[PDB]
Amino acid sequence: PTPLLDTINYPIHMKNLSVKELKQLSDELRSDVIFNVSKTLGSSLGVVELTVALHYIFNTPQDKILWDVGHQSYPHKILTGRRGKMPTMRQTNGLSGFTKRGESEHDCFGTGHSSTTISAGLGMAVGRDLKGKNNNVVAVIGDGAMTAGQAYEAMNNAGYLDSDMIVILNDNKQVSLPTATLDLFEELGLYYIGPVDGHNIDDLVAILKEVKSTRTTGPVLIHVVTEKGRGYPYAERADDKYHGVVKFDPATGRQFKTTNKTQSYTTYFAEALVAEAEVDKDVVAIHAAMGGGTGLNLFQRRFPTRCFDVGIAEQHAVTFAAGLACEGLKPFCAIYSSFMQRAYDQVVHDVDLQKLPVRFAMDRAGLVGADGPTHCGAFDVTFMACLPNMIVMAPSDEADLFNMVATAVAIDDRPSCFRYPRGNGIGVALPPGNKGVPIEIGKGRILKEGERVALLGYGSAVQSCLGAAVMLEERGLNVTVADARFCKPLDRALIRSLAKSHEVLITVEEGSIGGFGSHVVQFLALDGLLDGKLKWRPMVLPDRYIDHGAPADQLAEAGLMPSHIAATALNL
Amino acid sequence: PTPLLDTINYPIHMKNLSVKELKQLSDELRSDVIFNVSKTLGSSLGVVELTVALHYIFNTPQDKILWDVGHQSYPHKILTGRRGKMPTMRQTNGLSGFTKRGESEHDCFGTGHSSTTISAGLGMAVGRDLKGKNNNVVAVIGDGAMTAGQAYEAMNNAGYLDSDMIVILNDNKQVSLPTATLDGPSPPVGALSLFEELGLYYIGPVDGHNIDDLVAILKEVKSTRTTGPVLIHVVTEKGRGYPYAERADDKYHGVVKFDPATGRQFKTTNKTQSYTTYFAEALVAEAEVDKDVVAIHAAMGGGTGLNLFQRRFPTRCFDVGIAEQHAVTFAAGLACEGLKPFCAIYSSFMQRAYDQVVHDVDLQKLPVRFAMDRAGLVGADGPTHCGAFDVTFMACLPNMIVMAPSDEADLFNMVATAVAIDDRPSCFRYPRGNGIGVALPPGNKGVPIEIGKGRILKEGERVALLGYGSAVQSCLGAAVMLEERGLNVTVADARFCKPLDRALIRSLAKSHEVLITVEEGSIGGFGSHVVQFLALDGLLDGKLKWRPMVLPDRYIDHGAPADQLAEAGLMPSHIAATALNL
């Protein structure tokens, strides 16, 4: 089916094609990408031709092709000797769902988060020039990634430093976020070439040949125009869906309706928020690029006058919420915890200094699994929690999430963060939450009795704690499990009470071991409860970035999953 | 001549003094500056006319005049009732040297970081529109603020949403906006200031000092009759109407004490050997012998000290403009290509690049060094500029080594290790302030240090004061007496916050009745790490009596670092009070 690609293990092999074969090769690549994604598309498909043209033209890994986000670089990987590893792309122990510098020499940059390619490529371009080297730099940034500030300033500087580099604007007219499986410029003083057919491969080859070496005059933006999902009609027709398509039949487009087959924390936040804004005209939702993936599609439909896609500009989303909140709105930045890091300062400075009524509904909090280390949102519990007046929450379920939403909208005290994972609300065997009644902010909830050992933890981590303590449920609840559904402030009182009465605690968070665990320990230290009588066992994400997997795999290896909490509890 | 503007008390009063009265107001402002100097600049002067025009045209605080960074808004504050509080601006318990929403109704936003005004004013514009309100929104943003991504994306979105709102692109010379904690920012290439693709109304460039024209422009754009977002490129000499400031907007950015009559200033403050100078000196020294070394700064070249570095190693110096995100990911790209890029940047501004550190650098463990100036309390630039968070936010980032040199020697050693340690990133956090100038490499300030390994600086086994940088100086100063008291209370240069000296922590932890940690950071940083390490070293009963003596989890208003530190209870006196509490 793919005779060209069968003889392509690398960009050299592609160059052994003729330009004419590249159209054939791209169809093959798209059919490979289709198949790769068929298991459970649009960005990579939309990028095939330019990937092909770039690897036909450019001499990676000598030349540097940087893929903003790297989600569209499936053909790039395929064409860089990772074709047969596409099957395990993003899978645990497999390749990344992005270009990953550690994965491939052809991966110039370790992307996931967007808009970095320009800056990275600028870095490379300068860094080459500094070393007196002379290889190309190419970035491929999506139009979505171009909306980001770091893209734009990077271009400002790229076009200020005037180095060899070829930005490609891959305009399929899609804001496409960072994720690893499931997702002119006049004043920049940059050459601008396009828009062009981002699927006329031979033309992209021709352009790329003729632009990459203009470089003595400085950088070029090659605006190409793609079709997201290109060469998969269904993906072309429904790029938003198909971009992160589930298991689909390449024959029919028909896919597994995971979204509907579940109910996500996105959905819950979305439902809670679309519910909230009905009764609250100050409520305004803001997503950076993620009306879909923070679930706000219905919100955007229902409250279009209160919905703000900033594109992939989390900083924007947050400081725009700061501005909304400054005008006495109740702006809610829907965003992932991984992307909240982009807005970090905007939280700190733009919001929290003035203790603004910015709520943050924080998806993908902790380990996102598949989206790997670029997208593991394990750090918000740390970084948000060091910000004065950033209240931080983690709902155990949609009820708590709503309550949390409902408090933050109602509490103009200061901003509130609500962190909840990529996934769906599991609350069957494990105790979930209330029903939709605003709780006391900062006040945890014991969900299991016990005074020997207390498993302070929240959201995904409380599911783990409760899961760990399941047997303790059945055994007179020796091990308490507290919904430490407030990371900021902590339930200092509950902490104090458990920590003064328990031989030990376990803290658990789907976060790095600088977050909640460190807060609990901080608070205990402040309470002087960190005597040798007291112990505390932080069972969390380690201080190592977490390569793509299942969250369960990663959490298991991190040792916060029920088994590992239980192993801690056996160590206790 | 105070009188005229002295009898002026409200925006209405200012409006009452219009044509052939603006000049008198300017003279009064100059006189006020002189009076402020006698007992006890550059953008504020450069922005007088725009501020005047904006307050003349716009009915703040009903209308919203936002000031990107907020530093240039001295006339704004002056003209919004804080004229007699300019004397106490940036002073402890006084007003912010930036617009601060909690300071004034007229401060529509709380700035000090750059590039926020657009996003903020967009938020205000939307928020108005959503509330069915109809007040003007205007932001004044410098071009230097404009170079930032957050500016640019916000404008991208501003022009996407097409709400009524106004951006006054300030700074024709394109000179970096005057950051209260940064210094000679003039070699910055921040000149984004054009917006066709932003779909924003664009007007100007206009004389940003022709006030009556600014008023005229402002009337005809920032009426409620104007739909959608407008950029008013004004053209504003930084230092305008102060010749010396106009001549040296780099210096008069943030001029020291000076005589209005003569421009003569106390270069003295800057004549101190700063941590900027040490980093700069170390780095300019390092890059001589290291061609992988590339310094990067986000428009802070003066106050990261890199003016000499840019001079000596222009081929390795990268002002990215006010684009810390850019600096860090660009350093990630340099670092990817096997450089040893060093993002010189302030800890407050490093927060901008936070993700870029996390994602762009640390996930690939890139050789991005960070020379984090303004670490901890910067003092008088207050909560918008206190870099007390790096010790927290960086320290949760896998493989982000974090240091704090106790002096230039340690800073060099630190620099010299991170350059050598090109398998990972390293942050070096040192305050706004001064230390000791060491000899160049001829005197071998390239002392080798073991990264991650603290240094006991004072003996003691009763109490151990783990601290670094400003906080070690506090610990050692706390332990001044302890020293004269048979050295009961050790002080450890906890000069590594990541990794900690787990071994030393452990060894002090298990031997001392008590610890103190001390950091010129929030009580989420070093202290939280120590206690996290003690937690994990419950193997060795890290369950000592620990005292985190640090910046509270409260944003700190502009003051002296020492005032703020004292109030934060990390200063020597407070550590000693802690030591008595131990």
Numbering used by the authors:
A (entry chain A): 73 to 112, 116 to 258, 320 to 708
B (entry chain B): 73 to 112, 116 to 268, 320 to 708
Q: What does the paper behind this entry write?
A:
Small heat shock proteins (sHsps) represent a class of highly conserved molecular chaperones that prevent irreversible unfolding or aggregation of proteins under stress conditions to maintain protein homeostasis. In this work, we study Hsp21, a chloroplast-localized sHsp in all photosynthesizing plants that plays a critical role in chloroplast development, fruit maturation, thermomemory regulation and protection of the photosynthetic complex during heat stress. DXPS catalyzes the first and rate-limiting step of the methylerythritol 4-phosphate (MEP) pathway responsible for the synthesis of metabolic precursors for isoprenoids in plants. Here we show the formation of a stable complex between Arabidopsis thaliana plastid sHsp, Hsp21, and its natural substrate 1-deoxy-D-xylulose 5-phosphate synthase (DXPS) under heat stress, and report cryo-electron microscopy structures of Hsp21, DXPS and Hsp21-DXPS complex at near-atomic resolution.
Three-dimensional (3D) classification of the cryo-EM particle images identified subsets of unbound and Hsp21-bound DXPS particles, and the structures of free DXPS and the Hsp21-DXPS complex were determined to a global resolution of 4.0 Å and 3.7 Å, respectively. DXPS is a homodimer composed of three domains, with domain I being the most dynamic, indicated by the discontinued peripheral densities and the lower local resolution of this region. Each monomer adopts a distinct conformation, differentiated by the structures of the active sites located at the interfaces between domains I and II of the same monomers. DXPS catalyzes the oxidative decarboxylation of pyruvate to form 1-deoxy-D-xylulose 5-phosphate that requires opening and closing of its active sites. The density corresponding to the segment spanning residues 247–274, constituting part of the active site, is fully visible only in one of the monomers. This segment, previously reported to be flexible, likely undergoes disorder-to-order transition and acts as a gate to regulate substrate access to the active site. Moreover, the closed and open conformations resemble those observed in the pre- and post-decarboxylation states of Deinococcus radiodurans DXPS, respectively. Immediately after the segment 247–274, the density corresponding to a large surface loop of 52 residues long (residues 275–326), referred to as the mobile loop hereafter, is also missing in our structure due to flexibility. The final interface is defined by the interaction between the hydrophobic groove of the ACD of Hsp21 and residues 318–322 within the mobile loops of the DXPS. This segment spanning residues 318–322 in the mobile loop are disordered in the native DXPS but becomes ordered upon Hsp21 binding.
